């Protein structure tokens, strides 16, 4: 029976060790991923603000060119 009672312990050892990897995944929970979408949604609106500023600049540029001419 020693074989059986050693196989039981080694088997439960392997299983518990894999449960440890389950525990590691449990620790690994990710949230900066949730932050990435916010960062990108903000980068878009900021680039849009810059675009609006430059688009306001272009009309002044045309006015400057024509008036200087």
């Amino acid at each position: 029976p020693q074989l059986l009672c050693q196989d039981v312990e080694n088997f439960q050892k392997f299983v518990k060790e894999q449960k440890q990897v389950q525990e590691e995944i449990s620790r690994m929970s990710s949230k900066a991923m949730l932050k990435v979408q916010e960062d990108i949604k903000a980068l878009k609106q900021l680039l849009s603000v810059a675009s609006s500023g430059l688009q306001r600049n272009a009309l002044a540029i045309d006015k400057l060119k024509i008036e200087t001419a």
Partner: protein, 116 residues
């Protein structure tokens, strides 16, 4: 004895040998013709059948190919990749924001010159 056999099922259950891997068999879509070269001739030990079913259920097949996920240690490595990608991601957002801010400052200066 069915006791030792149930124990063998428990032993192959929670394990890295993919012997009915503890119902921990789970597939992730890792972004990726060489696709059709890799996605067939199946992977490191995943069953051809479930791998084909995964390539069948994989969303964004052009934006992602199937990748074996091996237990929860692989989930851990995946979350590590996730955190690293998130770091580079907010860093790239930072680069874009710096570009936008420089644009706005120089545009303000240009506009002020326009008035002169």
């Amino acid at each position: 004895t069915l006791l030792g056999d149930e124990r063998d099922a428990i032993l192959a259950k929670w394990n890295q040998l993919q012997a009915f891997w503890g119902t921990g068999k789970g597939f992730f879509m890792n972004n990726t013709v060489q696709i059709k070269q890799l996605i067939q001739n199946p992977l490191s030990g995943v069953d051809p059948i479930i791998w084909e079913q995964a390539k069948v259920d994989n969303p964004d097949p052009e934006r992602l190919i199937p990748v074996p996920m091996i237990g929860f240690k692989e989930l851990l490595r995946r979350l590590e990749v996730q955190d690293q990608m998130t770091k580079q991601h907010q860093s790239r957002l930072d680069i874009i924001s710096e570009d936008i801010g420089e644009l706005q400052k120089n545009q303000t200066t240009t506009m002020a010159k326009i008035g002169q």
